[PDB]
Enzyme design. Structure first.
Site, PDB file in Angstrom:
ATOM      1  N   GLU B  52       0.823  -1.194   0.000  1.00 42.62           N
ATOM      2  CA  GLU B  52       0.000   0.000   0.000  1.00 42.62           C
ATOM      3  C   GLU B  52       0.870   1.263   0.000  1.00 42.62           C
ATOM      4  O   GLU B  52       0.559   2.202  -0.728  1.00 42.62           O
ATOM      5  CB  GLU B  52      -0.948  -0.085   1.187  1.00 42.62           C
ATOM      6  CG  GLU B  52      -2.004   0.997   1.212  1.00 42.62           C
ATOM      7  CD  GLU B  52      -2.581   1.286   2.592  1.00 42.62           C
ATOM      8  OE1 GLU B  52      -2.666   0.341   3.432  1.00 42.62           O
ATOM      9  OE2 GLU B  52      -2.947   2.460   2.839  1.00 42.62           O
ATOM     10  N   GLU B 129       5.941   3.873  12.215  1.00 39.13           N
ATOM     11  CA  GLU B 129       4.514   3.652  12.410  1.00 39.13           C
ATOM     12  C   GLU B 129       4.254   2.680  13.555  1.00 39.13           C
ATOM     13  O   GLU B 129       3.233   2.808  14.230  1.00 39.13           O
ATOM     14  CB  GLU B 129       3.875   3.075  11.149  1.00 39.13           C
ATOM     15  CG  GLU B 129       3.484   4.111  10.116  1.00 39.13           C
ATOM     16  CD  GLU B 129       2.775   3.468   8.932  1.00 39.13           C
ATOM     17  OE1 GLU B 129       3.361   2.540   8.357  1.00 39.13           O
ATOM     18  OE2 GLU B 129       1.617   3.845   8.635  1.00 39.13           O
TER      19      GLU B 129
END
Ligand code: PTY
Lengths: 53, 438
Positions: B52, B129
């Site tokens: 992604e 993240e």
């Protein structure tokens, strides 16, 4: 023998009731161990991961 | 009565599904894929999420910069998200910018560079993240909930994947993942808003015709999960708010109890002290919680997957000495779904849901998401008439029967985060899943 009976005339009944008690109490002791271990297994099986802040 | 969802196929097996709205001027087009993190193993866990990132890092033609410019010139935006069983890539644009957007999507999906330089650059972004989701408490709670409920199973893995995999993901494994999973029979091109179906099918024939078909084409939304009653405690005395989720194994998309589980979920409902109306809600739990200040909020959920689900509640509370009361009363309301619910609660919840299921779809992105989700999980768009009929068929007997086999005296998965000293041990929580009086 007769005088022993005279001193303790409940003897025969007492020992038969004792046999019943022994059996029931032993079974209950076994089951109480299973139930304790069943309830305690989440505590006994607990695991930790520590990440120092 | 909303316009009909039109559906066509291509030869490769790509579905095109569209719902036009001549009252709006924007259109959401995108590709809904029946693939997600669940399709990874333990070695490439994190690949789907990694891709992604790289999908927007440049293609065989357009570079990253050119890609940026192209979308900026179109005027709308692009968006993407990867879940456990579903991946979405969509483009919101103007009515007449739809051919551009379909072209860009087809390009990033089929012809992405996945250059070693870009892989290495994202490897740090994704590493960061990992240490910033820590703040999103609800996500932390639900990721631990899946991890524990589906212990050591594919649904138990996170989407991000472990740190170790992030450092070892290669362009080879990325390419392999998207070649195996992003096949035409697993993909739906969806348009909602100002789109013509016939125009969208032409664009699909132009851009998505050279998509591989899978060797064994199963129907859309085709999957064995073995739920584990268990708990994760993430105690943190420095946090002011406790976050607690409790769930049982729930229902899959195509379960026969799908609507019964939604009705049961609506009987408990949601609560939020910040919303003015919440103190007046009909839900018994809502009344107990608001009158006693037991929580800041709670949200009932019934999450579905292809072959399983989780049904439960998510609570947030600052009342750290009455967490026991909050959990106690919550599980006593669940007990009543088995013992006490009648036509009173059931008919009320059905009324609320009949509207709720339609209300949710209030913009083109919401409509596209609905078409795409339904086509990738059920293999069809269920018309509001069919949904109204399935809801009407839910009786109080059905709710009680469902609760008695799904909730009553069942193992729970429990996650607590924050000042949870007041949350009792597993046994005392799980003992509230039945009533000795019944
Ligand atoms: C006061 C002293 C407490 C100690 C009790 C232990 C044994 C006394 C029971 C009398 C006795 O002889 O019972 C025998 C069986 O024992 C048994 O099976 C009894 C052992 C059971 C262990 C204790 C379980 C609960 C007892 C205490 C609760 C009392 C109040 C609660 C309502 C056989 O006698 P039998 O079988 O011929 O008797 C007629 C019914 N057929």
């Amino acid at each position: 023998a007769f005088l022993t009976w005279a001193a303790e005339p409940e003897h025969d009944e007492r020992k038969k009731l004792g046999l019943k008690a022994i059996i029931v109490i032993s079974a209950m002791l076994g089951l109480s161990v299973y139930i304790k271990k069943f309830k305690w297994s989440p505590i006994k099986n607990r695991k930790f991961i520590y990440n120092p802040p | 009565v909303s316009p009909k969802t039109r559906t066509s196929n291509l030869k490769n097996g790509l579905t095109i599904a569209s719902e036009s709205n001549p009252l709006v001027q924007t259109a959401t087009v995108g590709v809904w894929i029946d693939a997600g993190s669940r399709n990874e193993n333990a070695y490439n866990n994190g690949t789907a999420h990694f891709f992604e990132h790289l999908a927007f890092k440049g293609t065989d033609k357009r570079s990253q910069h050119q890609l940026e410019l192209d979308i900026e010139n179109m005027g709308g935006h692009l968006n993407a998200y990867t879940s456990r069983e579903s991946t979405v890539y969509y483009a919101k644009s103007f009515k007449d910018d739809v051919p551009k957007s379909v072209e860009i999507l087809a390009d990033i999906l089929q012809h992405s560079k996945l250059a070693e330089s870009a892989i290495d650059r994202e490897r740090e972004v994704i590493t960061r993240e990992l240490e910033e989701v820590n703040k999103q408490y609800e996500e932390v709670v639900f990721d631990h909930l899946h991890a524990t409920a589906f212990m050591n199973q594919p649904l138990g893995r996170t989407i991000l994947g472990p740190r170790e995999n992030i450092q070892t993901i290669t362009n080879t494994e990325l390419r392999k993942f998207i070649t195996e999973n992003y096949t035409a029979d697993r993909m739906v091109l969806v348009g909602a808003g100002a789109v013509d179906h016939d125009a969208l099918v032409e664009l699909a024939e132009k851009y998505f015709s050279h998509l591989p078909s899978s060797q064994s084409p199963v129907p859309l939304g085709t999957p064995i999960p073995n739920f584990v009653g268990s708990e994760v405690r993430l105690r943190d005395d420095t946090m002011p708010v406790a976050h607690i989720a409790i769930a049982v194994e729930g229902v899959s998309w195509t379960s026969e109890d799908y609507y019964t589980a939604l009705v049961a979920q609506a009987i408990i409902g949601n609560y939020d002290r910040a919303v003015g109306t919440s103190r007046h809600q009909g839900s018994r739990l809502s009344n107990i919680v608001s009158e006693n200040n037991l929580a800041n909020s709670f949200q009932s959920f019934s999450t579905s997957y292809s072959d399983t689900g989780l049904w439960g509640i998510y609570l947030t509370s600052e009342n750290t000495t009455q967490i026991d009361d909050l959990v106690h009363f919550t599980l006593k309301e669940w007990n009543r779904l088995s013992t006490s619910v009648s036509n009173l609660q059931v008919e009320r919840a059905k009324s609320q849901l009949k509207a709720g299921l339609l209300l949710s779809l209030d913009g083109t992105t919401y409509v596209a998401e609905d078409i795409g989700r339904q086509l990738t999980t059920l293999g069809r768009r269920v018309t509001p008439a069919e949904v109204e009929a399935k809801l009407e068929a839910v009786t109080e007997h059905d709710v009680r029967a469902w609760a008695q086999k799904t909730l009553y005296d069942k193992d729970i998965a429990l996650v607590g985060l924050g000042p949870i000293e007041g949350l009792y041990d597993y046994n005392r929580i799980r003992n509230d899943m039945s009533m000795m009086r019944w």
